[PDB]
Each structure stands twice: as C-alpha cells, then as structure tokens.
Design a protein around this ligand. Structure first.
Ligand SMILES: Nc1ncnc2c1ncn2[C@@H]1O[C@H](COP(=O)(O)OP(=O)(O)O)[C@@H](O)[C@H]1O
Ligand SMILES: Nc1ncnc2c1ncn2[C@@H]1O[C@H](COP(=O)(O)OP(=O)(O)O)[C@@H](O)[C@H]1O
Ligand SMILES: O=C(CN1CCOCC1)[C@@H](O)[C@H](O)[C@H](O)CO
Ligand SMILES: O=C(CN1CCOCC1)[C@@H](O)[C@H](O)[C@H](O)CO
Ligand SMILES: [Mg+2]
Lengths: 289, 287
C-alpha cells in the first residue's frame, strides 16, 4: 500500500524497511562475555514499573510456546532516576516473508485461552502493564465492554481532561459511552491473551520465522490486537488473511475496529500531543454518525 | 556510568556496543540508495512538509551544515502526506559537538556576511514549530516579530484552549518589559534552524548533522534557548559557538524570554504539564 506508492513515486523495484531505538525508550545492543544482550533505558520515574510490566508480558507470552519473544533478564535501577531493562538479543529484520506465519501464530495465541489447560475467565491481568509510559489498570472484570470502557477509554479521556481540558473530547465521550454496548452485537466475548501493542514496529523476523517484542499484555477481546496493526499499516495482507482463516470476523467487526483504534489515537494524544486530537475526535464522531 | 553499571549487574568483563522514529516514519532500502520517509496522516501534512523542505533548502544553500537532502513530498490516499529524504546513518551528537558549535555560529553569521542580505526578520513561507504553523510575516524589528508572531500567537492559543487567567495577566505585564531586554544592542537577521533541541541533531563519521528544522530569520540567540533548556548538548558545543559569537550583554534575561516561547509551545502541544514552567518563566522575567 504505502510501499506500493513509494515504489511508484520513487521508481524502485525493491523496498525493504529497516531499523538508540524506539519512541518510548532508548535501546542498544551490547556484546558481553555471556552473549549479546539488548538494553532499553528510560530515565522517567515510572520506568521500573513499565519494564516490570513488560517482563510480566514477555513471560506470559513465552509460557504459551506459540510465539518467539526475547527472554527478559534484568531490570536495573539507574542513579538519578529511571531504569534499564536487559533482555536477550535477537538478530532481526523487518517482517516480510514471515507475515502469514505470524498471522497464524497470533490467531493461535488468541485461541490459547480456550485450550483445556487455560482457565482465565475474566478480562484484565495479574499486574500493571504500561501503554507506552502510561500505567494501565488491569483489574479483573467479567464483562469486556465494561473493562475496555473503564480501564482503557475512560482512563485515557480522564488524562486528556486533566492535561488538555478538551471540551469536544468530553462531550463526544459522554455520547459514545451510551453507544458502546450496541457495538458488541449481543456477542459473548471470551478472554484472549494479547501482545497488546502489535504495531508493525514491534514485529520482525529472522530465518526461523517471525518474532514479536515490546508487549503490554492483558486478557482482552482478540479483535483489539489488530486495531493498531491496521491503523499504522506495515503488515502484509497475508498476515490478516492467515489470521482470519483461523478467527473469522464476528458481526460488527468494522465498527469495533473504530472503537479500538480510538483507544490508540487517545493514547497517542496523551503520549505525543495535539497532533492526535483530530483523529481522536474524528473517530468518535464517526462512531456517533 | 551506565556502562559500568551494566558491566557490574551482568558480571561481564566486556560490554561492546554494536548495531548502533520520534513518531515520524521509517527507513527503507531502495534501489537508488537508502531513503528515510516521514509520514503524517493529518490534512495539514503537505503544508508542514513543504515548510520543512523550504527550511532544509535554505540551510543547504549556505553549505555550512549537513542536513538530509529532501527528495519528494507525496500525497497519501486517505489523508496527509509522506516526505522522502536522503537517508543518513546517524548517531547522537558527541565527538562532533565542537564542530557543530562552529558551524551553527557560521550559519548565524552567514546572512549579514554574505552578498545577498535578508534585511528583515521572518521567512518567505510558513514553517511549523512541531505541529503548529507559524506566521513568518517580514518585520523590520526583532522584538516586534518575536512578541507578535511567536509569543502572542502561543498565548492566544492558550487563551482559546485553556482560558488561563494567570497567563493572560502575566502577559499583560511582560509585554511592556520586552524592549528593555533589547535596548542598546544591534540585532541582525540570522538564518536559524529554528528547533535545535538535542533530539534534532546527530553525527556520522564525517561530522555533525541537523534535521527537522523550522527555519526563519531571527535573533541568533533564540537558536540556543531550546538547546540549553532541554539539555543533551556537550559543553564544548557552546564553547565553540561562543568563541565565534560571544554572549552579548543581557544574554541571560533574553535567554529566559526565548525559553518562555518554547515552554508555551510545549504547553500548546502537550498540555498543562508545561503550565508551571511557562508561568514561572514569566514570573522570573517580571522580578
Ligand atoms: N531483544 C532485542 N534484540 C535486538 N534488537 C531489538 C530487541 N528488541 C528490540 N530491538 C530493536 O529495537 C527497536 C525498538 O525496540 P522497542 O522494544 O520497540 O522500544 P520502545 O518501547 O522504546 O519503542 C526495534 O525496532 C528493534 O529493531
Ligand atoms: N534523513 C534521515 N536519515 C536517517 N535517519 C533519520 C533521518 N531523519 C530522521 N531520522 C531518524 O528519525 C529520528 C527523528 O527524526 P525527526 O525528523 O526529528 O522526526 P520527528 O518529526 O518525528 O521528530 C532521528 O533521531 C533519526 O534517528
Ligand atoms: O509508540 C508506539 C507506536 N506509535 C509510535 C509513533 O507513531 C507511530 C506508532 C507504541 O509503542 C504504542 O502504541 C504507544 O505509543 C505506546 O508507546
Ligand atoms: O518535540 C520537540 C521537543 N520536545 C519533545 C519532548 O519534550 C522534550 C522536547 C520539538 O520538535 C519542538 O520544539 C516542539 O516540542 C514540537 O514537537
Ligand atoms: Mg524531531
């Protein structure tokens, strides 16, 4: 898509995405006596909490045996604030040929909780995981639209009120809250373990297959995983084809997709500022149309 | 340092870095070279990128500082635009800091010294500081340009979006005091990068690099305010710079005025986290 436009506008046969590293933290690879390691540094005061949530997320994904992610090694307090997180170094290129395989794996990951050796019947998580540098509440809830409205959308919009005092966001949210249960089409939603931040910048591949990293995990609706993948692009079509061969789109998928993308726009407004006010409000208005 | 801390916590004799964003775009390997692509999906994207292209071109024309070469601005289906530029292998500014200090002082001296002389403050097109378009209307007088097209623009947005009483009253008092900071000094228009914080500078094996400009002709000292206020520049950058352009009398108080602009811009971009520094800087200017 964007790659097709670039190939045409620039006149290139090939086009391979590549590549301190990251938007939240600084990341560098080091060679050590025991092997290569990768180290993320964040100087903010909440850094340890963020990295401990990433450690818990990595451990939950690794326990499934369905996807490859870096092994977490150590979280280290930094003099003068913040923390460093050391993990296994992985040789990686951007996701291309392994996209359909990753689609299969992410669908199996979401379906894992329905396997007989998994018993999680509520939405949430056993510990705090951060969306970027913003701590999230993962308090267990039986009802997914309640969990998502309260501990994702409302939490972001309360931060928008505090920091931006945005009248339009407040007024639109009140109207949207009324609509949210209708978007679920009377469906029974079952918990699915999510990577939680499956942007194209957080997936990659090597010669064995795809790799994913930087998770912010919780038990959620499987569909929420795909919203960030779709809105910022970067995943080949074959990723989604393989995924939906295993988990078909339930009724109302397209409208829930807007609701889940809304969360990501609000989170980008809080992290990155007013640039993201227009898509946030615009998505709310589209849901209310 | 952190490297010693890592050596100790991991219990390793060696710790050898290898392998060497900001909510922009991605790098792509292309048949004709590597390229770097910035994506902005909003409707104002093209205008913003055209300002960046114009800023990069004005800086490139001096031949004094290395910037990425702009290639193409492309309209995106479904809104916004992509900006393709030459890819540069880039590391954080350290060993080339002193060189960058020299080059930025030469950049600021280029206008008065060259043969074609821009004799007003402003720019020939709109350039954005971050995501906010600036008015660059030519003005003979720098305190007028800065008060109207930088400080007042920001404070009008703060009145609109926050209705902040304290900002309003402090501005009423501060506005009158601004000329005192400039009396008895000659101000010559100087081409500025316009957004020289530490995250917009880098280096490679050949020398320093600067990028993401928001250029205009301004007072040279304004350039340094964001560099100082958010840190990240080695002392040798400022030492080299001020060997060529020493601090004129009143430098520290003008520095507060210029940092105020940046605090207000951060309040408009990121919200009330920056209200306290904005108001506080105003109070320091009024003491
Ligand atoms: N375990 C790892 N080994 C090697 N490289 C990594 C590893 N994890 C991440 N990377 C590289 O670092 C980049 C950013 O990492 P990420 O964990 O997404 O940081 P952030 O939370 O700051 O966005 C990735 O694009 C990838 O190239
Ligand atoms: N021309 C380029 N070549 C290679 N890397 C680049 C180039 N431009 C930017 N980058 C990378 O992107 C980062 C942010 O670039 P910037 O232009 O400041 O984007 P933003 O507008 O999102 O802040 C830089 O620190 C650098 O690592
Ligand atoms: O930062 C992230 C993704 N955005 C970065 C800049 O714009 C393009 C995509 C993710 O890690 C996450 O969705 C959120 O920002 C928390 O950091
Ligand atoms: O982003 C910028 C600088 N701030 C980033 C986060 O906090 C530290 C400094 C600059 O590009 C510009 O001055 C403006 O903030 C719009 O982005
Ligand atoms: Mg920048």
């Amino acid at each position: 898509a964007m790659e097709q436009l670039l190939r045409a506008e620039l006149r290139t046969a090939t086009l391979r995405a590549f590549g301190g590293a990251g938007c939240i933290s600084e990341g560098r690879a080091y060679d050590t006596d025991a092997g290569p390691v990768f180290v993320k540094v964040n100087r903010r005061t909440q850094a340890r909490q963020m990295f401990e949530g990433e450690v818990a997320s990595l451990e939950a994904l690794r326990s499934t045996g369905l996807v490859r992610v870096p092994r977490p090694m150590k979280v280290i307090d930094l003099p003068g604030g913040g923390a460093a997180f050391v993990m296994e170094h992985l040789k990686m290129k951007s996701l291309s040929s392994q996209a359909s395989k990753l689609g299969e794996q992410m669908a199996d990951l979401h379906l894992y909780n329905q396997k007989g050796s998994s018993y999680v019947d509520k939405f949430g998580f056993h510990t705090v995981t951060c969306c970027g540098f913003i701590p999230q509440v993962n308090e267990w809830q039986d009802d997914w639209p309640t969990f998502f409205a309260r501990h994702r959308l409302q939490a972001q919009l309360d931060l928008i009120e505090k920091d931006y005092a945005d009248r339009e966001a407040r007024e639109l949210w009140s109207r949207l809250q009324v609509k949210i249960p209708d978007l679920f089409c009377g469906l029974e939603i079952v918990p699915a373990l999510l990577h939680g931040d499956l942007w194209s910048g957080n997936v990659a591949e090597d010669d064995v297959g795809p790799i994913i990293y930087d998770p912010a995990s919780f038990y959620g609706h499987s569909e929420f995983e795909l919203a960030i993948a779709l809105m910022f692009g970067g995943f080949p079509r074959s990723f989604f084809t393989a995924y939906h061969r295993k988990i078909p789109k339930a009724p109302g998928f397209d409208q829930r997709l807007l609701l889940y993308q809304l969360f990501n726009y609000l989170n980008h407004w809080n992290h990155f500022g007013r640039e993201y006010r227009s898509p946030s409000l615009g998505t709310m208005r589209r849901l209310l149309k």
